Amino acid sequence: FAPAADREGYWGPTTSTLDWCEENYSVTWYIAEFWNTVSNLIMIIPPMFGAVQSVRDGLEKRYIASYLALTVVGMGSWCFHMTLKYEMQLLDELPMIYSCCIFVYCMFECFKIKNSVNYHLLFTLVLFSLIVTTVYLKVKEPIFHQVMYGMLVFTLVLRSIYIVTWVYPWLRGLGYTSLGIFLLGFLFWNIDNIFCESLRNFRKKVPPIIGITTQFHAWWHILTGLGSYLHILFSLYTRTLYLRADLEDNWETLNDNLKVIEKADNAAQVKDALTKMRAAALDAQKATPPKLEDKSPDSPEMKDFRHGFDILVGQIDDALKLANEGKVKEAQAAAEQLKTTRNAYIQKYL
Ligand SMILES: CCCCCCCC/C=C\CCCCCCCC(=O)OC[C@@H](O)CO
Ligand SMILES: [Ca+2]
Ligand SMILES: [Mg+2]
Ligand SMILES: [Mg+2]
Ligand code: NA
Numbered sequence: 001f002a003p004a005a006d007r008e009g010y011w012g013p014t015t016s017t018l019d020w021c022e023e024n025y026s027v028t029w030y031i032a033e034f035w036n037t038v039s040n041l042i043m044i045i046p047p048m049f050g051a052v053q054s055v056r057d058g059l060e061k062r063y064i065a066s067y068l069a070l071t072v073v074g075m076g077s078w079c080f081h082m083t084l085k086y087e088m089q090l091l092d093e094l095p096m097i098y099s100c101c102i103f104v105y106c107m108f109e110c111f112k113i114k115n116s117v118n119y120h121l122l123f124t125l126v127l128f129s130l131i132v133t134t135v136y137l138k139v140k141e142p143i144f145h146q147v148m149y150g151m152l153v154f155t156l157v158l159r160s161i162y163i164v165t166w167v168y169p170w171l172r173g174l175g176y177t178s179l180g181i182f183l184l185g186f187l188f189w190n191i192d193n194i195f196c197e198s199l200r201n202f203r204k205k206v207p208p209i210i211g212i213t214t215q216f217h218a219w220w221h222i223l224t225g226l227g228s229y230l231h232i233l234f235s236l237y238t239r240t241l242y243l244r245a246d247l248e249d250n251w252e253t254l255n256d257n258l259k260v261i262e263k264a265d266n267a268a269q270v271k272d273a274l275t276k277m278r279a280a281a282l283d284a285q286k287a288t289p290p291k292l293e294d295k296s297p298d299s300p301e302m303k304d305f306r307h308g309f310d311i312l313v314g315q316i317d318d319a320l321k322l323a324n325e326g327k328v329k330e331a332q333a334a335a336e337q338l339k340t341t342r343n344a345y346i347q348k349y350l
């Protein structure tokens with residue numbers, strides 16, 4: 001039949017190349033596709049929280065950029081679903097290509113030396129994103145964007161599969177979980193497109209989730225936004241495991257900072273050295289020294305190695321307490337106590 005249309009237009013007409021299954025300005029006349037708009041908050045709030053945590057912890061620029069790029073994708077989608085115009089449509093679909101390009105760079109540079117740039121991969125991703133954008137603007141076909149975004153996700157999937165199968169099998173739960181929700185989100189994306197029915201919405205209890213659960217494109221933002229967030233976590237974790245210090249590194253850090261305390265002239269050096277010494281002590285306490293490599297981690301010699309570190313950590317905490325109390329000279333003099341306890345309980349096992 002030919003009844004009344006559910007798309008209750010207000011605040012400008014739809015000039016965008018495509019309009020989703022969600023009824024235009026049905027909940028409120030202020031924003032179009034209400035649930036497709038508000039669902040982008042999980043692609044705005046958590047990635048921004050991840051971006052500020054990354055700058056505070058002093059992480060690599062590419063990991064800060066990856067979190068901010070997802071926020072741009074979220075903000076762009078929030079602007080596109082609200083207005084439903086071609087101008088804001090590009091602000092949503094184009095950053096998806098750029099964010100994925102940043103993610104591809106991070107995933108292929110995870111096992112590279114710190115403070116190094118691969119200009120060959122960087123110029124390839126810039127050239128790819130430039131080619132994709134230029135033709136997408138000229139030929140306004142949305143299917144082309146979906147294909148080019150799909151192959152970027154596919155290359156990102158293969159790298160994540162290679163890492164979990166050959167390098168870090170620990171990231172199986174995180175890596176595969178990210179992948180699955182994303183495919184679950186992509187499944188729901190086609191449910192809203194192909195099975196576009198307002199019947200469920202119309203028949204009953206629209207205010208509850210039954211009315212709301214049928215907005216599968218909104219659930220797509222919820223799942224891909226959580227999925228991309230997970231991927232960044234996965235990417236970050238891959239880098240953290242590679243840049244992670246071993247027992248030999250921690251033992252060197254423990255001793256270098258111990259000599260720093262002995263030769264220190266100001267409070268900041270002593271405090272800094274004790275902080276770095278505590279981090280190295282707790283990390284070396286978990287590890288097995290080369291002389292105990294044959295023995296079990298629960299052996300009496302191993303319990304003695306951990307006991308020596310328990311005394312050392314405690315004495316570092318005592319020295320940090322003195323440093324935090326303004327007793328610089330007393331905290332500085334703790335170095336000989338720390339030197340004695342390592343010589344009497346730890347040094348014999350290395
Ligand atoms: C496994 C990690 C993948 C990282 C992807 C990074 C991009 C951000 C993720 C999701 C944005 C969703 C909201 C934007 C959705 C816009 C609709 C569109 O054109 O989608 C194209 C796809 O349906 C083609 O499959
Ligand atoms: Ca719509
Ligand atoms: Mg670096
Ligand atoms: Mg001074
Ligand atoms: Na329309």
Ligand code: NA
Nearest residue numbers: 213214216219
């Ligand atoms: Na659902």
Ligand code: NA
Nearest residue numbers: 246247248249
């Ligand atoms: Na080493």
Ligand SMILES: [Zn+2]
Nearest residue numbers: 036077217221
């Ligand atoms: Zn969308």
